[PDB]
Design a protein around this ligand. Structure first.
Ligand SMILES: Cc1cc2nc3c(=O)[nH]c(=O)nc-3n(C[C@H](O)[C@H](O)[C@H](O)COP(=O)(O)OP(=O)(O)OC[C@H]3O[C@@H](n4cnc5c(N)ncnc54)[C@H](O)[C@@H]3O)c2cc1C
Ligand SMILES: N[C@@H](Cc1c[nH]c2ccccc12)C(=O)O
Ligand SMILES: N[C@@H](Cc1c[nH]c2ccccc12)C(=O)O
Length: 629
């Protein structure tokens, strides 16, 4: 009898397959001849973009340990190359077929294929990823079309990449949307580049919900009146968050597009522009697009004729070439039949940690949890660890399964509360999720075990990447020591985010919102760092056009667009003329680095009550997670 069958092999399954190989667990992989989007994009020559996620969070520990030199955004091409290197390694263990049905019994599953070949397997893992409506538009849709109007119903990562591609052909972009959360993927900290995932210091939630909330949420909730911020200049991007019913912020089910803000894009790519473009570094600055009106927000309920092929705004019946409905995201699950008979119904909440469904035996889900920020690698590597422990250690299997139902309920209570299931429940803060799995598995760190300020910096402020939890213990990966050192030396041991936590420990929600936006460039959607980049934008469009062999007359005038652009940018034109963090952080960092190797418990009483606070980081009050305990 087959111990393990892995169904679906592209990206999510690699870390698990590695662990099974390490334990010499008998396993087979079944995966489609036809492959993924990535195979689609590759053969159509459309691996011409870059990830919205840091290298650190997007490639697995056992790669980063070899190839991490600096932070950078890997290209689509490089991401694919990495799937293909690991496919090549495990190809012998892969059967090229398509699974059509799984009949789940008491301690095994019957797997049916399109070939008609049948497979029996004790443990069955699904890693089939998602069908995505939008894949066609990246797959196939023409990036040679010009001067047309697109209407997008939802903003997501795919809409932003497509928009990135449509702007340089004077395509006009209307978002008829119920708001969206966009976040500069890269941020200046005293003028040094940090990917937004470097600045989340998630374990600060253990100090309190309240503190972690003002640490994180002012760029997402509309809490500041600072007129430099995109959600005051353009209030249409504001969202209905009344669905959030949890103390854990940012909440499960919050999604965001991560994007190049043009200043960081400039800093990175100005000196070899066309070369950088043609590798796949595309400017996708939604904030810049709104500033310059190459995109407009219109109200959600703006009238629209799909027959007449027009939308009514600015008292204009505007014709449009295409309405893009936006990215529905469906797990690619084959039919799963319970004890031979009853259809299993997938619902992320009805599953433990996105991984363990309730009425099935020895079936695990790998790749169906979405990280709020950073790459899937964080989620998928930790899930692979969790699934490997469940499959090979019956003690672990039993401990987790005994009370699976109460674990799921306690998880859903903590993270979702009374909220009805939403289609984005699969989305989680990466540094909560990785930490969650690490405490489940037992490869977590103990706050109580920090000795130096340095240890407190590593515990609280070093990002909860998967490889953080592979330094020591059951899932240790050689080279993680040197990776963490490298990463720590390059980022000042993450003292700047640690000092942010110090700085707002005593503020209320509104004080922290104001403080976060007092900076000369606050982290996300700072509209003061846009005008000065109009010239560069034209160089960029010229450069994009020369890489993709495009011709466009920039003198054509769409006076309806301009009336529309003017109608849309009314609040902005009112609010933009009305236009501490850098100082506090600057001092905080000087202080922390001065006591790096200073012993914690030892530190002296009443540089004020901030030491009292640093000392209480050994005994955080919000450490309980009832779906673990
Ligand atoms: C356009 C795009 C951009 C993305 N950008 C990023 C990014 O910047 N950063 C990031 O971290 N993530 C990104 N992702 C998300 C994620 O990294 C990819 O979706 C990744 O492909 C998911 O890996 P997977 O292994 O879960 O699924 P896939 O890579 O889709 O692989 C699953 C495999 O299983 C096969 N399969 C499915 N059903 C069956 C079946 N019944 N039987 C047999 N085989 C089956 C499929 O053919 C496929 O080859 C992006 C996704 C897309 C679509
Ligand atoms: N702590 C950083 C980074 C940050 C804030 N909110 C975020 C949301 C998502 C990711 C990163 C962040 C800041 O306050 O600016
Ligand atoms: N799901 C990706 C983000 C992403 C980028 N491009 C996409 C297109 C479609 C769906 C998701 C995406 C992640 O986990 O980081």
């Amino acid at each position: 009898m087959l111990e393990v069958c892995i169904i679906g092999f592209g990206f999510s399954a690699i870390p698990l397959v590695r662990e099974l190989a390490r334990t010499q667990t008998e396993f087979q992989i079944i995966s489609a001849e036809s492959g993924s989007v990535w195979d689609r994009l590759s053969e159509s020559g459309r691996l011409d973009f870059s990830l919205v996620s840091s290298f650190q969070t997007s490639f697995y520990s056992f790669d980063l340990v070899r190839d991490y030199e600096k932070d950078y955004y890997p290209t689509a091409k490089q991401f694919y190359e990495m799937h293909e290197r690991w496919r090549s390694v495990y190809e012998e263990k892969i059967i090229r077929d398509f699974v059509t049905k799984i009949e789940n019994f008491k301690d095994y599953s019957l797997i049916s294929t399109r070939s008609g070949k049948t497979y029996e397997a004790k443990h069955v893992v699904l890693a089939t990823g998602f069908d995505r409506l939008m894949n066609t538009f990246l797959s196939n849709f023409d990036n040679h079309v010009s001067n047309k109007t697109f209407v997008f119903d939802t903003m997501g990562d795919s809409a932003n990449l497509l928009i990135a591609k449509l702007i340089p052909n004077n395509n006009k972009i209307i978002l008829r949307t119920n708001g969206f959360t966009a976040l500069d993927q890269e941020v200046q900290v005293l003028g040094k580049p940090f990917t937004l995932d470097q600045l989340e210091s998630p374990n600060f939630r253990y100090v309190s919900s309240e503190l972690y909330d003002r640490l994180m949420m002012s760029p997402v909730y509309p809490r500041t009146v600072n007129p430099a911020v995109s959600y005051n200049q353009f209030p249409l991007i504001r969202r209905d968050f009344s669905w959030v019913d949890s103390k854990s912020s940012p909440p499960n089910g919050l999604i965001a597009i991560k994007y190049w803000p043009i200043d960081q894009y400039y800093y990175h790519f100005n000196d070899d522009l066309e070369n950088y473009i043609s590798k796949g570094y595309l400017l996708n600055d939604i904030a810049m697009w709104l500033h310059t009106g190459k995109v407009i927000l219109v109200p959600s309920d703006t009238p629209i004729n799909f027959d007449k092929k027009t939308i009514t705004y600015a008292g204009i019946e505007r014709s449009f070439h295409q309405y893009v409905k936006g990215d529905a995201e469906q797990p690619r699950l084959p039919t799963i039949l319970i004890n031979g008979e009853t259809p299993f119904e997938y619902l992320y909440r009805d599953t433990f940690m996105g991984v363990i469904p309730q009425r099935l035996n020895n079936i695990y889900f790998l790749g169906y949890t979405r990280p709020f920020t950073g790459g899937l690698a964080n989620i998928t590597e930790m899930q692979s660890l969790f699934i490997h422990k469940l499959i090979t250690q019956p003690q672990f299997h039993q401990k987790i399964h005994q009370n699976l139902s109460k674990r799921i309920t306690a998880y859903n209570q903590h993270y979702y509360g009374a909220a009805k299931p939403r289609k984005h429940d699969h989305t989680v803060p990466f540094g909560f999720y990785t930490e969650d799995i690490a405490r489940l598995i037992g490869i977590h760190y103990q706050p109580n075990e920090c000795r130096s300020v340095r240890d407190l910096l590593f515990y609280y402020a070093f990002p909860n990447n998967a490889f953080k939890y592979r330094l020591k213990g059951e899932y240790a990966v050689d080279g993680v020591d040197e990776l963490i050192q490298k990463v720590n030396d390059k980022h000042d041991h993450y003292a700047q985010v640690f000092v942010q936590a110090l700085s707002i420990r005593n503020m209320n929600s509104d004080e922290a919102a104001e403080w976060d936006h007092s900076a000369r460039r606050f982290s996300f959607n700072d509209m003061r760092h846009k005008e000065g980049y109009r010239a560069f934008l034209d160089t960029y469009l010229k450069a994009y056009r020369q890489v993709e062999n495009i011709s466009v007359d920039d003198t054509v005038v769409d006076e309806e667009w301009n009336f529309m652009v003017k109608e849309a940018c009314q609040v902005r034109d009112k609010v933009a003329p009305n236009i501490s963090k850098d100082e506090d952080v600057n001092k905080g960092i000087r202080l922390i680095l001065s006591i790096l190797d200073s012993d914690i418990s030892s530190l002296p009483d009443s540089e004020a009550q901030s030491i009292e606070f640093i000392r209480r980081l050994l005994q955080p009050k919000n450490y309980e997670l009832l779906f673990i305990r």
